[model samples]
Target chain A: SNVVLIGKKPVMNYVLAALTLLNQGVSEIVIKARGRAISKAVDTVEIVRNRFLPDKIEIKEIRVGSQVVTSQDGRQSRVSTIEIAIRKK
Target chain B: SNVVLIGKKPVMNYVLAALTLLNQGVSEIVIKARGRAISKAVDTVEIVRNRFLPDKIEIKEIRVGSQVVTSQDGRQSRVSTIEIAIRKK
Candidate 1:
């Protein structure tokens, strides 16, 4: 089996795209954006979590990392982690 | 260990940073994108799969979901799915 992994600061949109590819069997990808994009990523994630489905492509949090302060403002802070997953089939 | 899963339109940046957190400990993160963003996501995953995150983080793909064609015309469409997993030690 072939596998790949990526790491970055925290860019939601890029993350979404990369995951899409990963789901399609592209191995690995990563993208980290700055500013409001972080929250957008989080928000988008909430939508995915909230959606009602059974055994559909799901998000599983295995390892929860630490909080990394992006800006001096706490509002700009973010949490990190990882998981192995794919799209629903 | 804690885990959070999120999926959205393909966005490479978010996937990396989210995985960053996961590799550290935070379990899972997902992001899916529509249209062009999809390509970017693939690139990001390539970077991740290529990188060396150590056993710090892990990724797993489970189950299978598929595209629910939003439109048959091929102009506008949407694909959806479900999958789950967690991080490493």
Candidate 2:
């Protein structure tokens, strides 16, 4: 209920998702992404905090790390991950 | 003296650059990247902290934003940027 997992969708879509949660009384929203979608995740948070909800939300914490995952061919690889936690101000 | 800008270069290259600075007595290193390179920047920091310099360095802060830039076609666009600040532990 308080997480937004970023994917190939447009940045605004994630922003809207976050805003929806915030407007619905969710205290904190964790925006998470891995690999190439990390950029979009950052963009989504920026738009949510700076554009639509200016002065209304604040960043609580940012966690960065890597996870080992297996691909279709069963080759395991580590992928970078980010979780940006935000809450109402 | 404390900044590593991630580009198209290999992630290991940035990790080496960061390690060089840290080993030379730098108090803090700010790893910055934009657009597609943000993912690589995260990976570089993870490798530096989790693999080579485990328990020696820690993340201090993470800043995410966007900047406007003009392309070769003279069209301006917004690119997402990330700055990860890490300091010696």
Candidate 3:
């Protein structure tokens, strides 16, 4: 797996690209939690409304249903899920 | 450093919360990458304009910049930066 080291929030671009890739037959994307940035991830969806071409996407959230506490029990260990879907272009 | 799991884009809210925390004294926020999602970070910025209380923010974007590549050596090698600032409250 190629590690994408972006200089900013990685989820936004991942979501967008994930959707695009989905439409292009790119199935199965893995969105791993980045340290302590889960709430920020939700904030991203705040901007993404149904009007923003929401129809062209599908979403799913998975947790294994466990929380990621800081590295060894801190606030930086929170975890969440973000999944996007796109039809073939 | 605590982990706060979110449900959507990690950057948008990260910028917002980062800004808030910035105002509350949050220096040196680290934004890491995940796959290929830098552009989405930019898109999230689109929603984080001056309207969200701009004057109370100071931001500096950086780039030790290196692009990410796909496993196939084809597609997936773009990088960018996004930073948010908030004046102390």
Better of 2 and 3 by lDDT: 2
lDDT ranking from best to worst? 2, 1, 3
- Candidate 1's TM-score reads 0.30
Candidate 2, residue A1: Cα displacement in angstroms equals 1.9
**Candidate RMSDs in order:** 14.1, 2.1, 13.8
lDDT of 3 at B49: 31
Give the best candidate by DockQ. 2
Candidate 1 structure quality by residue, lDDT tens digits, B1-89: 23223335344545556566656655554433333233233333334443545455444543222344646567654443323343443
**Tens-place lDDT digits, model 2, residues B55-82:** 9898899988889899999999888899
The positional error of residue A82 in candidate 3, measured at the CA in angstroms, is 25
Worst 10 residues of 2 chain B by lDDT: B57-66
TM-score, ranked from best to worst:
2, 1, 3
Q: What would the per-residue lDDT of candidate 3 be over residues B1-89, giving only the tens digit for each residue?
A: 41112225666675675455444555444344332353333333323334454444333432212334565757674332222221332
Best by TM-score: 2
lDDT, residue B10, candidate 2: 90
Model 3: lDDT of residue B89: 28
**DockQ of candidate 1 compared with the true complex:** 0.04
Quote model 2's TM-score: 0.88
- RMSD versus native structure for model 1: 14.1
